[PDB]
């Protein structure tokens, strides 16, 4: 049913956007305490 499909899709992107924000909030804390961690070797 399309209403259920749409709801599944809306829910998946809500989660993704939340998760990106959760991550950026974690990353900013590292950036302001120990950025050495973030080195690309």
């Amino acid at each position: 049913s399309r209403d259920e499909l749409m709801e599944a899709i809306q829910k998946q992107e809500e989660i993704n956007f939340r998760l990106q924000d959760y991550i950026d909030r974690i990353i900013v804390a590292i950036m302001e305490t120990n950025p050495s961690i973030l080195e690309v070797k």
């Binding site: 809306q10 992107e13 809500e14 956007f17 939340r18 924000d21």
Partner: protein, 470 residues
Amino acid sequence: SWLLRLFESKLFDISMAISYLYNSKEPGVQAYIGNRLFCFRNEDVDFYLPQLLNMYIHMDEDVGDAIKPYIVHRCRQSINFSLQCALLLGAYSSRGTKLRKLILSRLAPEREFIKSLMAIGKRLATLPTKEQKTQRLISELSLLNHKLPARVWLPTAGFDHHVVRVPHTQAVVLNSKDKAPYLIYVEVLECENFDTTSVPARIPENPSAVALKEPWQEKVRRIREGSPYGHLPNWRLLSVIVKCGDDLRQELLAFQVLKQLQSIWEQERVPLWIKPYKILVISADSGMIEPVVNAVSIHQVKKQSQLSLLDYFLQEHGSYTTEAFLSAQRNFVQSCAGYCLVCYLLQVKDRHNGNILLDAEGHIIHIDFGFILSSSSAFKLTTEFVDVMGGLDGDMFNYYKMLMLQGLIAARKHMDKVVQIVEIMQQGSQLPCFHGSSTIRNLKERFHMSMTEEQLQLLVEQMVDGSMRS
């Protein structure tokens, strides 16, 4: 023909028009409403200009194209209207650009007047103290009188007018911050219609210069008496805060919500009290605010008085057996209940006594609407506030709760009108208050549309008891 029946009925108001414009995906409906906009009163439509323009920018071309001709029509009969369109179009895009340039295709006096005001504010960043800033401001404002009077006005004014003079000595800067806002007073001559009149003639000028803490009407007297133009019956005094580096779009959104709730509370018959203060968005970076006069922050009221809030009430109005006091108490209680509801419904955060004003009659007024809705403390009822209300067993305190319930009951009945305002603004918005995916869903839940009154009573109690814990 049942839908067209509705649209041709008296029911049809600007709100309903906008709702269907926003929700219907039928191009014939969109076009039909685009046509019927012309049929409404200017005043009523004016209030929703940001919505219309937001929709134009961020929605289907179909939707834009239905709205445009009306806007063009308004723009042709009022340059004030044109100005706000141009300002808003620019501010709400960072589609829009092509039309802005077409409206701006004259207005140079006003645009340059505003650019200069903006420019002034940006310079003050290099002066680290309030006093130094104020001195540069006062000097630099005096130079603008050199260009007055002209084809220039303050869109934040209740009426049509020409600006004639700036009492620069009276202007003041508000804080020591990097992009500090500054308050000014402006002299104007009222019109019946701006577009077809005057630009009045310069009067070259010649105590009124000294600035001190005094009431608004005593300050009008002093400035008027010193002014070349002060003798005229045509003459009036305005005021604006100029924010050169602060975004005001959240602030504008809040204004509309406050104004709607105000009308809702007037229409139902709940004597809650709040004060929407006018906003003018100039860019995504900058704008102006019409301040409330005869009002100062709670925090500084306690630092200049050195008194407790109640003691200040008693000093400034009289003993609690006097009229002046009982009336002020009532205004306190009615303004508190109002603003509590607003804080809860909008999830207003960053609440402290720097953000709450007290006026001459005892109304409070909340002000800094950064941090609302989804944006990442809440409204508080300190015992100092409860004391002014006469305490927990007070009649007036019981009545405070009574008002809260009544105003909530009222809100629920007109929920759509409130939600509409926010929901349309969210469209192509990148603003912190819409950071969530569930901003509107959370907002609707907060009306508790399923509840019976008894349930709401309990919610009000929870809310109040929550406001006291800290």
